[PDB]
Subunit: 231 residues, 3 copies
């Protein structure tokens, strides 16, 4: 395990996701409100899935070698397995907060699936120049998602409770900033142009992942917006 | 890319799915009705997914070699990745049109999953005679789906709005004819008996795919059946 | 096929799932009640999926070799493909019976996904001692599911119809006993410590699978709890 310099960040990531999972699990024990239960379920599952995939990367299972540029390049494929399930759960948290219509939710989840799926294909593609074609398609799917979060959701939040409108606005802003960093790190890291070494890349993704999951969850689950308006 | 004679049909397929995706995306921009949004979301996602998988076939990612009959046989596995997601979306379009009950929708999607999954296993099976066992099981799942579309849905459409009944009937008929061709092409093509060469097989699937997705979508999204009855 | 001593149990399993599938399919033909249709759909799909995966194991497709302990160890990976889809369907049968809230259903299905997914990783892991780390995480996800079935569902059933409360209690008890055997068989069988040989392991899983699917389904589909209260 320690044979890879990036192991320290995989281990820290595993620990922080594990701790985040346990914290949300305990916190949600005292919850009976049916609406709050939905948000706790979604939000606890996110770091639990990430915990398993960080562990698989730490132990070496979630790593494969991909030939491109005349080299055997270490590619952590387990990231995409994580993201396939956790990024639509994160979007679902946002969509339920603002009572999004079903068509909009399906558009978001579908675009998200395309985003992660094409990122996976790009990560595993052996023809170097083609990796960036997949990156571009994935990034276009991301831009669609960000567009919807701003010009379909923000003006939906404003007709809702003030506490859900303010909580949505904060989580929207956190999401757009954090999620936009992922394609940049991929592009300059070992999957793309290879300018930033894998150990630093792994650190960067770990900070983004913990912030986008445990950070996000801490903000959401401390808000009164997750509860039905009750006396 | 041009090293494979079937590349021209993969390229045309990619282009037509891409163009179809953009057309539906633009067309749905001016839509606020919650019901119509569902149909636009579902129907736009279908060629978008197909676009990505056609591209993966064009660039060579979605192709693998399978030993059977003492030969290395080129198998485009990306078709099944496409179909796994797009065929239940197509069925969902039909089921929502007639306000199908939840049990029926689950039966359809489940049978569809079995249909595509067993087709994938058959496509990748190395014992030649066993490929046709999987083809038979998949075809039985197809026949179940077609049965339900006729003797569970058609008589559901008739108690609904005339515009939804007439639109459903047309899309049902398009679906049954087009979908029934797929097992025949598989059986006589490079996956099955090998009587029709891969380049012609690829052409045939491209025509079926564009018709079943973009053709289907053009009929559906031009109907007033996708809108709630409103003043 | 007969080259593997466990083939007889794979063949019997295939037959019993096939027969169970046909029986439930015929039985549900005379059903119009929308609630009952949901239970028939879910419950018929379960042995149908299991039938396909038992067949893939019989024909040899669903088997791979995994190096650990200095040996090439036969691992039937198709079990996890089965279980990935059938265990959440089984939980859905239980959850719908007691009209579980959406948050609880998502927690169950999510924990179940983690349970099966980590079992799959453990089954395919090449570092022997690490296989048991994945077994432990999977078992913890199982224990969460069993906890919810007892201390979240049982007291939900009691405020419902007596026929649904009594049917739920029986199916809950069947589920907890049968499902708890699976991690034990894995641990002592060819995936784990290797004390019980593969042919006996295969027998054990076949008895558990038929009981947990066809047995379970026979109890559920003969109950009046699956019908809406109607005059
Ligand atoms: C009911 O609605 C609220 C339940 O949501 C909360 C439900 C949770 C989503 C349940 C899912 C967590 C499972 C229990 C997962 C089990 C293994 C976890 C990964 C635990 C890992 C952390 C520990 C090992 C440090
Ligand atoms: C509604 C939304 C969910 C829409 C989803 C959007 C989605 C369509 C976007 C594209 C997803 C698609 C790229 C998934 C591809 C998975 C694939 C990378 C798995 C690895 O297999 C690739 C090659 C080795 O590089 O296998 C070597 C050759 C092997 C023989 C491969 C044969 C097995 C195939 C992988 C079977 C395909 C199954 C499905 C792709 C399962 C989806 C997995 C998940 C990653 C989407
Ligand atoms: C809101 O409900 C309506 C939105 O549906 C319409 C929503 C669409 C389903 C959004 C999904 C499309 C994504 C934007 C996919 C991005 C890449 C596409 C494959 C674009 C490819 C076509 C172009 C490259 C020729
Ligand atoms: C409700 C509905 C959705 C019901 C669904 C119906 C469904 C059950 C029908 C059968 C689906 C099943 C056949 C999927 C099999 C996928 C498999 C072909 C992927 C390729 O792996 C096959 C071999 C190489 O040929 O791998 C070589 C050996 C490798 C070590 C394989 C180990 C990895 C396994 C593939 C893990 C299994 C994961 C699940 C099958 C994911 C499902 C993918 C999708 C195609 C259904
Ligand atoms: C409508 O709601 C009730 C339908 O549920 C019942 C619907 C069923 C879930 C339909 C799914 C079964 C498909 C017809 C599967 C076809 C192949 C089966 C595996 C048949 C195998 C058994 C036989 C070959 C012995
Ligand atoms: C809401 C709930 C559903 C939550 C779900 C919980 C879930 C997160 C729990 C963990 C699931 C995760 C372990 C699935 C891993 C599948 C993996 C074993 C498939 C086989 O690939 C493993 C190695 C060979 O051993 O591939 C060799 C290297 C290859 C290059 C691998 C590259 C292809 C990757 C497999 C692509 C990943 C796609 C997704 C994992 C699809 C999920 C399949 C299913 C088994 C969950
Ligand atoms: C918890 C994990 C999260 C929130 C991950 C988010 C990841 C993305 C938004 C990834 C986006 C990518 C692209 C837009 C193109 C390049 C490849 C990706 C997959 C890194
Ligand atoms: C957009 C793509 C569509 C609508 C594809 C539909 C495909 C089918 C109905 C495929 C059916 C098959 C069988 C019935 C058995 C042989 C294998 C298949 C998968 C080709
Ligand atoms: C129809 C099949 C059923 C109901 C299978 C149930 C399987 C399980 C509950 C498996 C559990 C496992 C663990 C808890 C850890 C070890 C690995 C598994 C996957 C066997
Ligand atoms: C969105 C953030 C992307 C920028 C990442 C900056 C990383 C700087 C680290 C120094 C680069 C290491 C190069 C020498 C090894
Ligand atoms: C459902 C349509 C299946 C029939 C396809 C007919 C294809 C005819 C093309 C000629 C066959 C090529 C054989 C000589 C290369
Ligand atoms: C939950 C049941 C696990 C116990 C399984 C008992 C199997 C006993 C069979 C005898 C073991 C075979 C060892 C000699 C080959
Ligand atoms: C490819 C995996 C996509 C599914 C991820 C799980 C999250 C799905 C959330 C469903 C949202 C509800 C839509 C109506
Ligand atoms: C194996 C992939 C199956 C899921 C495909 C995505 C479409 C699912 C549509 C869900 C229909 C709603 C059922 C209640
Ligand atoms: C990884 C596969 C998980 C999906 C299995 C299919 C069963 C899903 C049942 C959905 C229950 C409804 C939740 C709201
Ligand atoms: C186009 C929608 C406006 C809100 C999205 C902001 C786009 C940020 C760009 C992210 C950088 C990705 C490379
Ligand atoms: C049995 C349901 C009647 C409607 C379905 C028509 C079946 C068409 C056969 C398709 C050919 C597949 C090989
Ligand atoms: C902790 C919840 C109480 C009900 C679950 C009973 C646990 C049975 C243990 C199963 C054995 C697995 C190794
Ligand atoms: C070796 C790099 C070749 C450049 C490929 C860039 C493609 C980016 C596509 C953006 C439309
Ligand atoms: C080499 C071909 C052997 C014939 C197999 C046909 C099987 C079809 C099954 C239909 C019930
Ligand atoms: C070779 C076996 C080494 C023992 C591993 C047991 C790990 C079990 C983890 C339970 C917390
Ligand atoms: C990680 C295993 C958890 C099993 C005990 C249940 C913890 C309490 C959860 C309350 C919903
Ligand atoms: C509760 C702490 C969980 C941390 C387990 C994984 C950390 C890796 C240590 C090497
Ligand atoms: C908008 C046109 C999209 C076409 C891109 C793929 C066509 C392949 C050209 C070689
Ligand atoms: C209807 C009987 C189904 C049995 C088919 C599979 C049994 C395997 C026989 C070798
Ligand atoms: C993006 C950083 C999130 C910070 C989380 C802090 C949570 C405290 C309530
Ligand atoms: C099956 C062929 C469909 C033809 C689509 C034409 C759409 C015009 C409205
Ligand atoms: C766990 C054993 C189940 C027994 C099923 C018998 C069904 C008869 C109604
Ligand atoms: C990591 C366990 C958290 C302890 C409880 C925190 C207050 C709910
Ligand atoms: C008003 C919300 C500001 C949140 C910005 C957080 C940036 C990481
Ligand atoms: C809305 C601001 C987006 C900031 C992008 C930051 C990418 C590192
Ligand atoms: C391909 C872009 C379509 C242009 C608009 C068509 C009329 C909505
Ligand atoms: C009355 C609907 C006829 C549609 C037939 C289309 C055949 C491709
Ligand atoms: C309902 C008519 C089906 C026609 C099947 C055509 C197959 C090529
Ligand atoms: C296996 C076929 C079952 C025959 C009908 C049983 C009574 C519904
Ligand atoms: C009162 C229900 C008892 C069911 C026990 C079944 C054990 C296999
Ligand atoms: C509730 C009793 C569980 C019995 C476990 C049996 C495991 C073989």
């Amino acid at each position: 395990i320690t044979g890879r310099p990036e192991w320290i960040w995989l281990a820290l990531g595993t620990a922080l996701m594990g701790l985040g999972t346990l914290y949300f699990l305990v916190k949600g024990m005292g919850v009976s409100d049916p609406d709050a239960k939905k948000f706790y379920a979604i939000t606890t599952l996110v770091p639990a899935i990430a915990f398993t995939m960080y562990l698989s990367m730490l132990l070496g299972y979630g790593l494969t070698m991909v030939p491109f540029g005349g080299e055997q390049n270490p590619i952590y494929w387990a990231r995409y397995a994580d993201w396939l399930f956790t990024t639509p759960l994160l979007l679902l948290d946002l969509a339920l907060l603002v009572d999004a219509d079903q068509g909009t939710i399906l558009a978001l989840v579908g675009a998200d699936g395309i985003m992660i799926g094409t990122g996976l294909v790009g990560a595993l593609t052996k023809v170097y120049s083609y990796r960036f074609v997949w990156w571009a398609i994935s990034t276009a799917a991301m831009l669609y998602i960000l567009y919807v979060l701003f010009f379909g959701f923000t003006s939906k939040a404003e007709s809702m409770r003030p506490e859900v409108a303010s909580t949505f606005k904060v989580l929207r802003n956190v999401t757009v900033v954090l999620w936009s960093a992922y394609p940049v790190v991929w592009l300059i890291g070992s999957e793309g142009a290879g300018i930033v070494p894998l150990n630093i890349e792994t650190l960067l993704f770990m900070v983004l992942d913990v912030s986008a999951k445990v950070g996000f969850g801490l903000i959401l689950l401390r808000s009164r917006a997750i509860f039905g308006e009750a006396e």
